[PDB]
Coordinates of C-alpha atoms and ligand atoms in Angstrom, one line a residue:
Chain A
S1 CA -47.3 -11.0 -30.2
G2 CA -49.1 -8.6 -27.8
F3 CA -51.5 -9.4 -24.9
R4 CA -55.1 -8.1 -24.5
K5 CA -58.2 -8.9 -22.5
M6 CA -59.9 -11.0 -25.1
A7 CA -63.5 -12.2 -25.4
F8 CA -64.8 -15.3 -27.3
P9 CA -66.5 -14.5 -30.6
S10 CA -70.1 -13.8 -29.6
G11 CA -71.9 -14.8 -32.9
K12 CA -73.2 -18.2 -31.6
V13 CA -74.7 -16.4 -28.6
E14 CA -76.0 -13.3 -30.6
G15 CA -78.4 -15.7 -32.4
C16 CA -80.0 -16.8 -29.1
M17 CA -80.8 -13.3 -27.5
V18 CA -84.5 -12.2 -27.4
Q19 CA -86.6 -9.5 -25.7
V20 CA -88.9 -10.7 -22.8
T21 CA -91.7 -8.4 -21.6
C22 CA -94.1 -9.1 -18.7
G23 CA -96.3 -5.9 -18.1
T24 CA -93.9 -2.9 -17.9
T25 CA -90.7 -5.0 -17.1
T26 CA -88.5 -5.6 -20.2
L27 CA -85.3 -7.6 -20.0
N28 CA -83.3 -10.1 -22.1
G29 CA -83.9 -13.9 -22.5
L30 CA -81.8 -16.7 -24.0
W31 CA -83.6 -18.8 -26.7
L32 CA -82.3 -22.4 -27.0
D33 CA -84.4 -25.0 -28.9
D34 CA -88.1 -24.2 -27.9
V35 CA -87.3 -22.6 -24.5
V36 CA -86.5 -19.0 -23.5
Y37 CA -84.4 -18.7 -20.3
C38 CA -84.6 -15.4 -18.4
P39 CA -84.6 -14.0 -14.8
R40 CA -87.7 -14.9 -12.8
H41 CA -87.9 -11.3 -11.4
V42 CA -89.3 -10.4 -15.0
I43 CA -92.8 -11.2 -13.5
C44 CA -92.3 -8.5 -10.7
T45 CA -93.2 -4.7 -10.5
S46 CA -91.1 -2.4 -8.2
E47 CA -93.8 -3.0 -5.5
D48 CA -93.5 -6.8 -5.9
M49 CA -89.7 -6.7 -5.8
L50 CA -89.6 -5.5 -2.0
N51 CA -90.7 -9.1 -0.8
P52 CA -91.8 -11.2 -3.8
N53 CA -93.7 -14.6 -3.6
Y54 CA -92.6 -16.1 -6.9
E55 CA -94.7 -19.3 -7.1
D56 CA -97.6 -17.0 -6.0
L57 CA -96.8 -14.1 -8.5
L58 CA -96.3 -16.8 -11.3
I59 CA -99.7 -18.6 -10.8
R60 CA -101.4 -15.3 -11.7
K61 CA -99.8 -15.1 -15.2
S62 CA -101.2 -16.9 -18.4
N63 CA -98.9 -17.7 -21.4
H64 CA -100.2 -14.6 -23.3
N65 CA -98.9 -12.3 -20.4
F66 CA -95.3 -13.0 -21.8
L67 CA -94.3 -11.0 -25.0
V68 CA -91.2 -12.6 -26.5
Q69 CA -89.5 -10.8 -29.5
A70 CA -86.8 -12.4 -31.6
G71 CA -85.7 -9.3 -33.7
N72 CA -89.0 -8.1 -35.3
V73 CA -90.8 -11.5 -35.0
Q74 CA -93.3 -12.5 -32.1
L75 CA -92.7 -15.9 -30.4
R76 CA -95.9 -17.4 -29.0
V77 CA -95.3 -18.7 -25.4
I78 CA -97.1 -22.1 -24.8
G79 CA -95.6 -22.9 -21.3
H80 CA -94.0 -21.4 -18.2
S81 CA -92.2 -22.9 -15.2
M82 CA -89.5 -21.9 -12.7
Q83 CA -86.2 -23.5 -12.0
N84 CA -84.6 -21.7 -9.0
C85 CA -84.3 -18.0 -10.0
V86 CA -84.7 -18.5 -13.8
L87 CA -88.0 -18.5 -15.7
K88 CA -88.4 -21.1 -18.5
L89 CA -90.8 -20.0 -21.2
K90 CA -91.7 -22.8 -23.7
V91 CA -92.3 -21.3 -27.2
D92 CA -94.1 -22.7 -30.4
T93 CA -90.8 -22.4 -32.5
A94 CA -87.4 -24.0 -31.9
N95 CA -84.4 -21.5 -32.5
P96 CA -82.9 -22.4 -35.9
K97 CA -79.6 -20.7 -34.7
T98 CA -79.4 -22.9 -31.5
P99 CA -75.6 -23.7 -31.2
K100 CA -74.2 -26.9 -29.6
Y101 CA -74.3 -25.9 -25.9
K102 CA -74.1 -27.0 -22.2
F103 CA -75.1 -25.3 -18.9
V104 CA -72.1 -25.3 -16.5
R105 CA -71.4 -23.7 -13.1
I106 CA -67.9 -22.0 -13.0
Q107 CA -65.7 -21.5 -9.9
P108 CA -64.4 -18.2 -8.5
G109 CA -61.2 -17.3 -10.5
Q110 CA -62.6 -18.7 -13.8
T111 CA -63.2 -16.2 -16.6
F112 CA -66.0 -15.9 -19.2
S113 CA -67.3 -13.6 -21.9
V114 CA -70.4 -11.4 -21.3
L115 CA -72.6 -10.4 -24.2
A116 CA -74.3 -7.2 -22.9
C117 CA -77.8 -6.7 -24.4
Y118 CA -80.7 -4.3 -24.1
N119 CA -84.3 -5.0 -25.5
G120 CA -82.9 -8.4 -26.8
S121 CA -80.3 -6.5 -28.9
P122 CA -76.6 -7.3 -28.2
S123 CA -74.7 -4.0 -27.8
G124 CA -71.2 -5.3 -26.6
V125 CA -69.0 -8.1 -25.4
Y126 CA -66.2 -8.1 -22.7
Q127 CA -64.2 -10.6 -20.6
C128 CA -64.9 -11.2 -16.9
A129 CA -63.8 -13.3 -13.9
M130 CA -66.0 -14.8 -11.2
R131 CA -64.4 -12.9 -8.2
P132 CA -63.7 -14.9 -5.0
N133 CA -66.7 -13.0 -3.5
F134 CA -68.9 -14.3 -6.4
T135 CA -69.5 -10.8 -7.9
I136 CA -68.3 -9.8 -11.4
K137 CA -66.7 -6.4 -12.2
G138 CA -69.2 -6.0 -15.2
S139 CA -70.5 -3.0 -17.2
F140 CA -74.3 -3.0 -17.1
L141 CA -77.1 -0.2 -17.2
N142 CA -80.8 -0.8 -16.6
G143 CA -82.3 -3.3 -19.1
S144 CA -79.1 -5.5 -19.1
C145 CA -80.7 -8.3 -16.9
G146 CA -80.8 -11.6 -18.8
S147 CA -77.4 -10.8 -20.4
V148 CA -75.4 -14.1 -20.4
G149 CA -71.8 -15.2 -19.8
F150 CA -70.1 -18.1 -21.7
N151 CA -67.0 -19.9 -22.7
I152 CA -66.5 -21.6 -26.1
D153 CA -64.8 -25.0 -26.3
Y154 CA -64.4 -26.2 -30.0
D155 CA -68.0 -25.5 -31.4
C156 CA -69.7 -25.9 -27.9
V157 CA -70.9 -22.8 -26.1
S158 CA -70.7 -23.4 -22.3
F159 CA -73.3 -20.9 -20.7
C160 CA -72.1 -20.1 -17.1
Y161 CA -73.8 -16.8 -16.1
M162 CA -77.1 -14.9 -16.4
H163 CA -77.2 -11.2 -15.1
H164 CA -79.9 -10.5 -12.4
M165 CA -78.9 -7.4 -10.4
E166 CA -76.3 -4.7 -9.5
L167 CA -74.9 -4.2 -5.9
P168 CA -74.5 -0.7 -4.4
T169 CA -70.6 -0.7 -4.9
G170 CA -71.4 -0.9 -8.7
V171 CA -70.4 -4.7 -9.2
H172 CA -72.8 -7.4 -10.5
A173 CA -74.7 -10.6 -9.3
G174 CA -76.4 -13.4 -11.2
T175 CA -77.1 -17.2 -11.5
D176 CA -75.9 -20.2 -13.5
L177 CA -78.4 -21.1 -16.3
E178 CA -80.2 -23.5 -13.8
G179 CA -81.1 -20.3 -11.7
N180 CA -78.6 -20.9 -8.8
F181 CA -77.1 -17.6 -7.6
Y182 CA -73.3 -17.1 -7.6
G183 CA -72.7 -15.8 -4.0
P184 CA -75.0 -15.2 -1.1
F185 CA -77.5 -13.0 -3.0
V186 CA -81.3 -13.2 -3.6
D187 CA -83.5 -11.7 -6.3
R188 CA -85.3 -9.1 -4.0
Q189 CA -84.9 -5.3 -3.6
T190 CA -83.2 -5.5 -0.1
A191 CA -79.9 -4.5 1.6
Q192 CA -77.2 -6.7 0.0
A193 CA -73.5 -6.1 -0.2
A194 CA -70.4 -7.6 -1.9
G195 CA -68.2 -9.3 0.7
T196 CA -64.5 -8.3 1.1
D197 CA -62.9 -9.2 -2.3
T198 CA -59.5 -11.0 -2.7
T199 CA -56.9 -11.2 -5.5
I200 CA -56.8 -14.4 -7.6
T201 CA -53.2 -15.5 -7.1
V202 CA -53.0 -18.3 -9.7
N203 CA -54.3 -15.7 -12.3
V204 CA -51.7 -13.1 -11.3
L205 CA -49.0 -15.8 -11.8
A206 CA -50.5 -16.8 -15.2
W207 CA -50.3 -13.1 -16.2
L208 CA -46.6 -12.8 -15.0
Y209 CA -45.9 -15.8 -17.4
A210 CA -47.8 -13.9 -20.2
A211 CA -45.4 -11.0 -19.6
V212 CA -42.2 -13.2 -19.8
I213 CA -43.5 -14.7 -23.1
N214 CA -43.9 -11.1 -24.4
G215 CA -40.4 -10.1 -23.2
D216 CA -41.3 -8.2 -20.0
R217 CA -38.7 -9.8 -17.6
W218 CA -37.4 -7.2 -15.1
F219 CA -39.3 -8.7 -12.1
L220 CA -37.6 -12.2 -12.4
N221 CA -34.9 -12.8 -9.7
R222 CA -32.5 -15.6 -8.7
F223 CA -34.7 -16.6 -5.6
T224 CA -37.1 -19.5 -5.1
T225 CA -39.5 -20.1 -2.1
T226 CA -42.1 -22.7 -0.9
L227 CA -46.0 -22.8 -0.9
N228 CA -46.1 -22.3 2.9
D229 CA -43.7 -19.3 2.9
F230 CA -45.4 -17.7 -0.1
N231 CA -49.0 -18.3 1.3
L232 CA -48.0 -16.3 4.5
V233 CA -47.2 -13.4 2.1
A234 CA -50.5 -14.1 0.1
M235 CA -52.7 -13.8 3.2
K236 CA -51.0 -10.5 4.2
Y237 CA -51.9 -8.7 0.9
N238 CA -55.5 -10.2 0.6
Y239 CA -54.4 -12.8 -2.0
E240 CA -56.1 -16.2 -2.2
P241 CA -54.0 -19.2 -0.9
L242 CA -52.0 -20.9 -3.7
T243 CA -52.6 -24.7 -3.6
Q244 CA -50.7 -27.7 -5.2
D245 CA -53.5 -27.8 -7.8
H246 CA -52.6 -24.2 -8.8
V247 CA -48.9 -25.1 -9.2
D248 CA -50.0 -28.2 -11.4
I249 CA -52.3 -25.9 -13.5
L250 CA -49.3 -23.5 -14.1
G251 CA -47.1 -26.5 -15.3
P252 CA -47.5 -25.7 -19.1
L253 CA -46.2 -22.0 -18.5
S254 CA -43.3 -23.1 -16.1
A255 CA -42.0 -25.6 -18.8
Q256 CA -42.6 -23.1 -21.8
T257 CA -40.5 -20.3 -20.0
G258 CA -38.1 -22.4 -17.7
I259 CA -39.4 -20.4 -14.7
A260 CA -40.5 -22.8 -11.9
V261 CA -43.9 -21.8 -10.3
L262 CA -42.1 -21.2 -6.9
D263 CA -39.5 -19.1 -8.8
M264 CA -42.3 -16.9 -10.2
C265 CA -43.9 -16.9 -6.7
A266 CA -40.6 -15.4 -5.3
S267 CA -41.1 -12.6 -8.0
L268 CA -44.7 -12.0 -7.0
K269 CA -43.6 -11.9 -3.3
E270 CA -41.1 -9.1 -4.2
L271 CA -43.7 -7.2 -6.3
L272 CA -46.1 -7.3 -3.3
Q273 CA -43.5 -6.3 -0.7
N274 CA -41.6 -3.6 -2.7
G275 CA -44.2 -2.4 -5.4
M276 CA -43.4 -1.9 -9.1
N277 CA -40.7 0.9 -8.5
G278 CA -42.2 3.0 -11.4
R279 CA -42.2 0.2 -14.0
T280 CA -45.2 -1.4 -15.7
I281 CA -46.0 -5.1 -16.7
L282 CA -47.9 -5.6 -20.0
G283 CA -48.8 -1.9 -20.0
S284 CA -50.4 -2.1 -16.5
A285 CA -49.3 -0.5 -13.1
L286 CA -51.6 -3.1 -11.3
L287 CA -51.1 -6.9 -11.0
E288 CA -53.9 -8.2 -13.3
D289 CA -55.9 -11.2 -12.0
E290 CA -58.7 -11.7 -14.7
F291 CA -56.6 -14.0 -17.0
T292 CA -56.6 -17.8 -16.2
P293 CA -53.6 -20.1 -17.0
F294 CA -55.8 -21.5 -19.9
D295 CA -56.5 -17.9 -21.1
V296 CA -52.7 -17.2 -21.3
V297 CA -52.0 -20.5 -23.2
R298 CA -55.0 -20.0 -25.6
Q299 CA -54.0 -16.4 -26.6
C300 CA -50.2 -17.2 -26.8
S301 CA -51.0 -20.3 -29.0
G302 CA -54.0 -19.0 -31.2
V303 CA -56.8 -21.7 -30.8
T304 CA -60.0 -20.8 -32.9
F305 CA -63.9 -21.2 -32.8
Chain B
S1 CA -72.4 0.9 -13.4
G2 CA -68.9 -0.4 -14.2
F3 CA -66.5 0.5 -17.0
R4 CA -64.9 -2.1 -19.4
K5 CA -63.2 -2.2 -22.8
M6 CA -66.3 -3.3 -24.7
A7 CA -65.9 -4.7 -28.2
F8 CA -68.8 -4.9 -30.7
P9 CA -70.6 -8.2 -31.1
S10 CA -68.4 -10.1 -33.6
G11 CA -71.2 -12.3 -35.1
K12 CA -71.8 -10.1 -38.3
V13 CA -67.9 -10.2 -39.0
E14 CA -67.5 -14.0 -38.1
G15 CA -70.0 -14.8 -41.0
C16 CA -67.5 -13.1 -43.5
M17 CA -64.2 -14.8 -42.4
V18 CA -62.5 -17.2 -44.9
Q19 CA -59.1 -18.8 -45.4
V20 CA -57.0 -17.8 -48.5
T21 CA -54.1 -20.0 -49.6
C22 CA -51.6 -19.2 -52.4
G23 CA -48.6 -21.6 -52.6
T24 CA -47.5 -22.5 -49.0
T25 CA -48.9 -19.1 -47.6
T26 CA -52.2 -19.2 -45.7
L27 CA -53.9 -16.2 -44.1
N28 CA -57.4 -14.8 -43.6
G29 CA -59.8 -13.1 -46.0
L30 CA -63.0 -11.1 -45.8
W31 CA -65.9 -12.4 -47.9
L32 CA -68.4 -9.6 -48.7
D33 CA -70.9 -10.3 -51.6
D34 CA -68.8 -12.0 -54.4
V35 CA -65.4 -10.5 -53.3
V36 CA -62.7 -11.9 -50.9
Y37 CA -60.3 -9.1 -49.6
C38 CA -57.0 -10.2 -48.1
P39 CA -53.4 -8.9 -47.8
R40 CA -51.5 -9.0 -51.1
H41 CA -48.4 -10.6 -49.5
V42 CA -50.4 -13.9 -49.6
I43 CA -48.7 -14.2 -53.1
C44 CA -45.1 -13.7 -51.6
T45 CA -42.5 -16.6 -51.2
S46 CA -39.7 -16.7 -48.6
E47 CA -37.3 -14.7 -50.9
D48 CA -40.0 -12.1 -52.0
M49 CA -40.1 -10.5 -48.4
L50 CA -37.2 -8.1 -49.0
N51 CA -38.1 -6.4 -52.3
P52 CA -41.4 -8.0 -53.6
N53 CA -42.5 -6.8 -57.1
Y54 CA -46.3 -7.5 -56.5
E55 CA -47.2 -6.7 -60.2
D56 CA -44.7 -9.3 -61.4
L57 CA -45.6 -12.0 -58.7
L58 CA -49.3 -11.5 -59.5
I59 CA -49.3 -11.7 -63.3
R60 CA -47.7 -15.2 -62.9
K61 CA -50.9 -16.3 -61.0
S62 CA -54.1 -17.8 -62.3
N63 CA -57.5 -17.8 -60.4
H64 CA -56.9 -21.5 -59.6
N65 CA -53.6 -20.6 -57.8
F66 CA -55.9 -19.1 -55.0
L67 CA -57.6 -21.7 -52.7
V68 CA -60.5 -19.8 -50.8
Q69 CA -62.2 -21.9 -48.0
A70 CA -65.4 -20.8 -46.2
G71 CA -65.7 -23.2 -43.3
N72 CA -65.7 -26.6 -45.1
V73 CA -66.9 -25.3 -48.6
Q74 CA -64.3 -24.4 -51.3
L75 CA -65.1 -21.1 -53.2
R76 CA -64.2 -20.9 -56.9
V77 CA -62.1 -17.8 -57.7
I78 CA -63.2 -16.4 -61.1
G79 CA -61.3 -13.1 -61.0
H80 CA -58.4 -11.2 -59.2
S81 CA -57.0 -7.7 -59.0
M82 CA -54.7 -5.7 -56.7
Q83 CA -55.9 -2.4 -55.1
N84 CA -53.0 -0.8 -53.3
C85 CA -51.9 -3.5 -50.7
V86 CA -55.0 -5.7 -50.8
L87 CA -55.8 -8.6 -53.2
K88 CA -59.5 -8.7 -54.3
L89 CA -60.6 -12.3 -55.3
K90 CA -63.9 -12.4 -57.3
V91 CA -65.7 -15.7 -56.4
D92 CA -68.8 -17.4 -57.9
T93 CA -70.9 -17.3 -54.6
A94 CA -72.1 -14.1 -53.0
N95 CA -71.7 -14.5 -49.2
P96 CA -75.3 -15.0 -48.0
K97 CA -74.2 -13.8 -44.5
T98 CA -73.0 -10.4 -45.9
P99 CA -74.2 -7.8 -43.4
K100 CA -75.0 -4.2 -44.2
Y101 CA -71.5 -2.7 -44.4
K102 CA -69.2 0.1 -45.6
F103 CA -65.4 0.8 -45.7
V104 CA -64.1 3.8 -43.7
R105 CA -60.6 5.1 -43.2
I106 CA -60.2 6.2 -39.5
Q107 CA -58.1 8.9 -37.8
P108 CA -55.5 8.2 -35.0
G109 CA -57.4 8.2 -31.7
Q110 CA -60.5 6.3 -33.2
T111 CA -61.3 2.9 -31.5
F112 CA -62.6 -0.4 -33.2
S113 CA -63.0 -4.1 -32.4
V114 CA -60.6 -6.7 -33.8
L115 CA -61.7 -10.2 -34.6
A116 CA -58.4 -12.1 -34.4
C117 CA -58.7 -15.2 -36.7
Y118 CA -56.4 -18.2 -37.8
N119 CA -57.2 -20.4 -40.9
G120 CA -60.5 -18.4 -41.4
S121 CA -61.7 -19.4 -37.8
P122 CA -62.2 -16.6 -35.2
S123 CA -60.2 -16.9 -31.9
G124 CA -61.2 -13.8 -30.0
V125 CA -62.5 -10.2 -30.1
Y126 CA -60.9 -7.2 -28.3
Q127 CA -61.1 -3.4 -28.5
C128 CA -58.2 -1.1 -29.5
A129 CA -57.3 2.3 -30.9
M130 CA -55.3 3.7 -33.8
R131 CA -52.3 5.1 -31.9
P132 CA -51.0 8.6 -33.0
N133 CA -48.0 6.8 -34.7
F134 CA -50.6 4.9 -36.9
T135 CA -49.9 1.5 -35.2
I136 CA -52.2 -0.6 -33.0
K137 CA -51.4 -2.6 -29.8
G138 CA -53.0 -5.8 -30.9
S139 CA -52.7 -9.5 -30.0
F140 CA -51.8 -11.3 -33.2
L141 CA -49.7 -14.5 -33.8
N142 CA -48.3 -15.8 -37.1
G143 CA -51.3 -16.5 -39.5
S144 CA -53.5 -13.6 -38.0
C145 CA -52.8 -11.6 -41.3
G146 CA -56.1 -10.5 -42.8
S147 CA -57.9 -10.3 -39.4
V148 CA -60.1 -7.1 -39.6
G149 CA -61.1 -4.2 -37.3
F150 CA -64.6 -2.7 -37.4
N151 CA -67.3 -0.6 -35.6
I152 CA -71.0 -1.6 -35.7
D153 CA -73.3 1.5 -35.5
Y154 CA -76.9 0.3 -35.8
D155 CA -76.9 -2.9 -38.1
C156 CA -74.1 -1.5 -40.4
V157 CA -70.5 -2.9 -40.1
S158 CA -67.9 -0.2 -40.7
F159 CA -64.7 -2.0 -41.8
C160 CA -61.7 0.2 -41.0
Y161 CA -58.6 -2.1 -40.6
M162 CA -57.0 -5.2 -42.2
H163 CA -53.9 -6.6 -40.4
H164 CA -50.7 -7.0 -42.5
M165 CA -47.7 -7.2 -40.1
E166 CA -45.8 -6.9 -36.7
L167 CA -43.1 -4.2 -36.3
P168 CA -39.9 -5.0 -34.3
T169 CA -41.4 -3.3 -31.2
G170 CA -44.4 -5.8 -30.9
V171 CA -47.0 -3.5 -32.4
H172 CA -49.2 -3.9 -35.5
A173 CA -49.5 -2.2 -38.9
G174 CA -52.3 -2.7 -41.5
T175 CA -54.5 -0.9 -44.1
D176 CA -58.0 0.4 -44.7
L177 CA -60.2 -2.0 -46.8
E178 CA -59.0 -0.1 -49.9
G179 CA -55.4 -1.4 -49.2
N180 CA -53.8 1.9 -48.1
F181 CA -51.5 1.6 -45.0
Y182 CA -52.2 3.6 -41.9
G183 CA -48.9 5.6 -41.3
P184 CA -45.8 5.4 -43.4
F185 CA -45.5 1.6 -43.5
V186 CA -45.1 -0.8 -46.5
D187 CA -45.7 -4.6 -47.0
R188 CA -41.8 -5.1 -47.1
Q189 CA -39.5 -6.7 -44.4
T190 CA -37.2 -3.6 -44.3
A191 CA -36.2 -1.4 -41.3
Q192 CA -39.5 0.6 -40.7
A193 CA -39.4 2.6 -37.5
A194 CA -42.7 2.9 -35.5
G195 CA -42.8 6.7 -34.7
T196 CA -42.6 7.7 -31.0
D197 CA -46.1 6.9 -29.4
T198 CA -48.0 9.8 -27.7
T199 CA -51.1 9.5 -25.4
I200 CA -54.5 10.4 -27.0
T201 CA -55.3 13.4 -24.8
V202 CA -58.9 13.8 -26.0
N203 CA -59.5 10.1 -25.0
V204 CA -58.0 10.5 -21.5
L205 CA -60.3 13.5 -20.9
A206 CA -63.3 11.5 -22.2
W207 CA -62.4 8.7 -19.6
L208 CA -62.0 11.3 -16.7
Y209 CA -65.6 12.5 -17.7
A210 CA -66.6 8.7 -17.6
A211 CA -65.1 8.6 -14.0
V212 CA -67.3 11.6 -12.9
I213 CA -70.5 10.1 -14.5
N214 CA -69.9 6.9 -12.4
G215 CA -69.5 9.2 -9.4
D216 CA -65.7 9.9 -8.8
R217 CA -64.5 13.6 -8.4
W218 CA -61.4 13.2 -6.2
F219 CA -59.1 14.4 -9.1
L220 CA -60.9 17.6 -9.9
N221 CA -59.5 20.9 -8.6
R222 CA -60.4 24.6 -8.4
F223 CA -58.2 25.7 -11.3
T224 CA -58.8 26.2 -15.0
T225 CA -56.3 26.7 -17.9
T226 CA -56.1 28.2 -21.4
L227 CA -56.0 25.7 -24.4
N228 CA -52.4 26.8 -25.2
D229 CA -51.0 26.5 -21.5
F230 CA -52.5 23.0 -21.3
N231 CA -50.9 21.9 -24.6
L232 CA -47.4 23.4 -23.4
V233 CA -47.7 21.2 -20.2
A234 CA -49.2 18.1 -21.8
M235 CA -46.6 17.8 -24.6
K236 CA -43.8 17.5 -21.9
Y237 CA -45.6 14.2 -20.9
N238 CA -45.8 13.0 -24.6
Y239 CA -49.6 13.8 -24.8
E240 CA -51.0 14.7 -28.2
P241 CA -52.0 18.4 -28.8
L242 CA -55.6 19.1 -27.8
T243 CA -57.3 21.2 -30.6
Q244 CA -60.6 23.2 -30.7
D245 CA -62.1 20.1 -32.6
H246 CA -61.3 17.9 -29.5
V247 CA -62.8 20.6 -27.2
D248 CA -66.0 20.8 -29.3
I249 CA -66.3 17.0 -29.4
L250 CA -66.2 16.8 -25.5
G251 CA -69.1 19.4 -25.3
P252 CA -71.8 16.7 -24.5
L253 CA -69.7 15.1 -21.6
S254 CA -69.0 18.7 -20.3
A255 CA -72.8 19.4 -20.2
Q256 CA -73.8 16.0 -18.6
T257 CA -71.2 16.5 -15.7
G258 CA -71.3 20.4 -15.5
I259 CA -67.4 20.5 -15.9
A260 CA -66.1 22.8 -18.6
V261 CA -63.5 21.0 -20.9
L262 CA -60.7 23.4 -19.7
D263 CA -61.5 22.7 -16.0
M264 CA -61.1 19.0 -16.9
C265 CA -57.8 20.0 -18.6
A266 CA -56.7 21.6 -15.3
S267 CA -57.5 18.3 -13.6
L268 CA -55.5 16.2 -16.1
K269 CA -52.5 18.7 -15.7
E270 CA -52.6 18.1 -11.9
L271 CA -52.9 14.3 -12.4
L272 CA -49.8 14.3 -14.7
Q273 CA -47.9 16.4 -12.0
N274 CA -49.0 14.3 -8.9
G275 CA -49.7 10.7 -10.2
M276 CA -52.6 9.1 -8.2
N277 CA -51.1 8.5 -4.6
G278 CA -52.3 4.8 -4.5
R279 CA -55.8 5.6 -5.9
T280 CA -57.4 4.2 -9.1
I281 CA -59.9 5.7 -11.6
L282 CA -62.4 3.2 -13.1
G283 CA -60.1 0.4 -11.7
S284 CA -56.9 1.7 -13.5
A285 CA -53.7 3.1 -11.8
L286 CA -52.7 4.7 -15.2
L287 CA -54.5 7.3 -17.4
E288 CA -56.5 5.3 -20.0
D289 CA -56.5 6.8 -23.6
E290 CA -58.2 3.9 -25.6
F291 CA -61.8 5.2 -25.0
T292 CA -63.3 7.9 -27.3
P293 CA -65.9 10.6 -26.4
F294 CA -68.3 8.5 -28.5
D295 CA -67.4 5.2 -26.7
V296 CA -68.1 6.9 -23.3
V297 CA -71.5 8.3 -24.3
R298 CA -72.1 4.6 -25.7
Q299 CA -71.3 2.6 -22.5
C300 CA -72.0 5.2 -19.7
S301 CA -75.4 6.1 -18.2
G302 CA -77.1 9.3 -19.3
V303 CA -77.6 10.1 -15.5
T304 CA -74.4 11.2 -13.6
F305 CA -73.9 9.7 -10.0
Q306 CA -73.5 13.0 -7.9
Ligands
USH1 C1 -49.1 -15.3 -43.4 C2 -47.9 -15.8 -42.8 C3 -47.5 -14.8 -41.6 N1 -47.7 -13.4 -41.9 C4 -46.9 -12.8 -42.9 C5 -46.0 -11.6 -42.4 O1 -46.2 -11.1 -41.3 N2 -45.1 -11.2 -43.3 C6 -44.7 -9.9 -43.5 C7 -45.5 -8.9 -44.1 C8 -45.1 -7.6 -44.2 C9 -43.8 -7.3 -43.9 C10 -42.9 -8.2 -43.3 C11 -43.4 -9.5 -43.2 O2 -42.7 -10.6 -42.7 C12 -41.3 -10.8 -43.1 C13 -48.7 -12.8 -41.2 O3 -49.3 -13.2 -40.3 C14 -49.1 -11.4 -41.8

């Protein structure tokens, strides 16, 4: 029993983190087989960052202008190339700790674990969602760039995020491991801002189900509603539309608790219209939206890795 | 920027997690060098719950009654003793993945990471705190018994908790790695009352300093307070007494922000009085008490956003 913001065990990813240095820029890289993956802006100085030409800045670098440190061992770079906004450094040595892995692109609303690192040294792990505005509410200081996000499925690490930059509101922006940005961001020092954020409705409903499973029940009511009806309420409070796919995804929690999704929607409707009237839900005064339906099921069932 | 419940990287602990079976009871164990540590109730049957006599249940066991499994490999038990409420199984293979480690008993208010495990396989890692009533608000299903709590300072793993049981209120009790329970709990299925929980005042103050560092001052005020007048107000909200030790420990966060501890105490007093009026602090609409002064220095910039 109990419910907590829970990260995947980070061990399989700890063994992939290395330090990448190019001149006076140090940041983190991901060492899988004989390639180190890291942000392409590693080849830039502050001056270069104002309006970089990457293919141009890259042509000027030899292999020996990239220092790669795996703990207290030097990796010799034998190859460099860009894919979108990530730099691929080929190295002489395959990573013996290379886990089974894939690169995947996640959707807004999907969660993942971030292993925060500094000088190729993992310092912490926390759980995150891709916000509907394609930012993450992370915790990163300078030197964090190249920190990765991941899901574990059986023995298979699914890498989904690499950290590139912080926005002025204090939230974070990055790429998939193929160097495609999440959101309308670019790797340049320029005026960029997070768009208006919205609440991940299906996740709030999943979390209400986690509450019922843990005996928090006061917000349940006798009332039901429809998608159309509820969605007019959703739009009013800056909540994402709820779709038939979302109802389908919540099926396993509606069966396990005997609360129909549109039942639970009627409760969320009431919480949005009236507030929490002094009470909490799972020790929170806010409606929590960084747990997926799968996250709730996985934690309330105990699947291992 | 940002502020998150950050756990330590679990990798160094994952390499120590094993499965321990005795009879029909399976839970987790911690493999360090040639010793596996797990809860002693691994040796308890259905009926033993109420009034187990551990000494009597244990002397009836051989080494070969204890199946220890490290991933796929079976470990040979060559020895066993009880120390307080943990069983220590001597095995014939030193764990090659043993990290630099030590055992430390922690005080209420201290934080640590939990590696939740089932059948010796890790499921997840989260951060929590030793409540003043010596329980922890964990996430822990049946079979989680033997899951451990730890801090990692440099490359050295500090083991401070092994999980033993859930109390009727949905909260968790366990032991240090020498088998002594935190709080007045026992490995028995009897009526044990979790003491009344109080808020860890020193941690709330630390987290208010965190909010200033990340550039939020809306909750400060022009007042100050004496230690004693703060304690008389705070105990009416079920907040732990703040002591000189707690004030000394907040020194560095005082200096980085320029806000004297007692001025921050004045701010907390007012926050308790007013609530937040539809505002948040580091994304929370409650006062958060599961971050320590040391955690805030760890995760927050050395440069305040003024
Ligand atoms: C290992 C099987 C499940 N289990 C045992 C448990 O919780 N038993 C227990 C311990 C102390 C007091 C009362 C208890 O239950 C009546 C754990 O996960 C641990």
